[PDB]
Design a protein around this ligand. Sequence first.
Ligand code: ATP
Ligand code: CA
Ligand code: MG
Length: 526
Amino acid sequence: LTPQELEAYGISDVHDIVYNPSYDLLYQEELDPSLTGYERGVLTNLGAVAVDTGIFTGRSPKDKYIVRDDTTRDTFWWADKGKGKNDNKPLSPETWQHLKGLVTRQLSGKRLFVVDAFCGANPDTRLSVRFITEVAWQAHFVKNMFIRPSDEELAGFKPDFIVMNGAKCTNPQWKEQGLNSENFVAFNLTERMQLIGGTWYGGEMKKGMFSMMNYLLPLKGIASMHCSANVGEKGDVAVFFGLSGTGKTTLSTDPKRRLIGDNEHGWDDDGVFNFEGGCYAKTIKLSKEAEPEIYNAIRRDALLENVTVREDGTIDFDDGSKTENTRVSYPIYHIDNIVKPVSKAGHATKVIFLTADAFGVLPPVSRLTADQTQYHFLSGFTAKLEPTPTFSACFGAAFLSLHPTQYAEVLVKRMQAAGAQAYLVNTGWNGTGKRISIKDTRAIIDAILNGSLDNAETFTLPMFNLAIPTELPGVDTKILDPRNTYASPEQWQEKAETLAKLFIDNFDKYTDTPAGAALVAAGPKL
Ligand SMILES: Nc1ncnc2c1ncn2[C@@H]1O[C@H](COP(=O)(O)OP(=O)(O)OP(=O)(O)O)[C@@H](O)[C@H]1O
Ligand SMILES: [Ca+2]
Ligand SMILES: [Mg+2]
């Protein structure tokens, strides 16, 4: 609020502070025709502002660093201490101070936007975050994606985390400091700050705080989950884990169910709760007949990123020539059917693992055993494209601050206490070399949530030993068995053996505990 207050963080000579801009103020700030470069917004015919995020159109895990100090040394899952790969690269406190002078100097003597907000729907576990930026649309991003405080909550607002966005500065000493590049996304848990240099991508702030929630919550016994969530009229809660592009936002935004959130949730003694106040949807080749809710949320106060807007202001949603990662964020009340005023609900009884399998091996749906649930949670499989595999522990290893086993343990405890069941859903590819359609996927989710799948007759799919139904109301029976989508079942066999090998090698790192070694029997077997 006052310059004396920003000076505590290291920023000086700030004349104009814009505290908690309203949506109307951000709209005017973004459309100021005097803006230059990547600060500029343009109005689209849908009424929503669109921006260009610059060189970076996604996260930069190679530039992510965590200060290694006595607070984090023995608790963090470090990239250099084994046994599993992750992006939590250690940083010295000395280099941290250098990066902090870079960002604070860049922000000094600027018009700064400051946004106070919450991460976490429950007062007992939420972080009070203070975001500092010089770009209006960046402030708009965090206004959309975090929980917007009431007037009364601003009154006594006490930040316990600061994120300073120094996107316009770069680090010229990076080669001497052993870093990946002149950009940086740095975290210091002793100071409780995130610094961002060089990249304008707003997702770094969203996932920065998620990584911070992923550090603190499981240490209190609370699951911290990379998943969307919604609840039926009968009060039944479902969560949908998955890696990028697998359908968390697409498939949780069903107007029969009340949306809880689309990306980040905790699970405590009272149930599943959203960390966020908005949604962040992929728009590449957006249909509108396939995703009407998401489409109609694109209006004033939504923020489009990197989409092509024509001279007449209309949007070419099919154009990925800047990036396939085109995006729109919006506050969650742009969705008509949501839980409100607080984004939370009871304990989940359906746990869905979304995966997009470019190898075309995995069945569209399968009810997992309790051990297959752990095996597939720790594996975190998806594949892209020709197919390249990704194994990302807990379906979100980019954001884990603790060891994967820690997340697995908390999830199992919550699931067992609630009597929850888990399901593996391939929203990716089959023998057709096409992605299964959203229509067919939505019907499969319906069969999961309404008990149809639990009461179906099943057989065991070989190799992966996954229980699959012979038929389901609403679904093409042909696709339920992935072997039928090839001309010869021997074609599937060949790819299943390839994929099973990748799973087996990947899981080996978990077999150094007796419990992990016993899970190998739940995995695929050659
Ligand atoms: N059968 C399907 N089920 C779900 N999504 C599908 C399907 N086929 C294609 N898609 C596309 O996949 C994308 C899913 O985007 P979505 O925002 O749901 O990703 P996400 O899982 O939330 O990941 P991110 O965290 O990157 O946003 C959309 O572009 C959607 O249209
Ligand atoms: Ca994601
Ligand atoms: Mg999404």
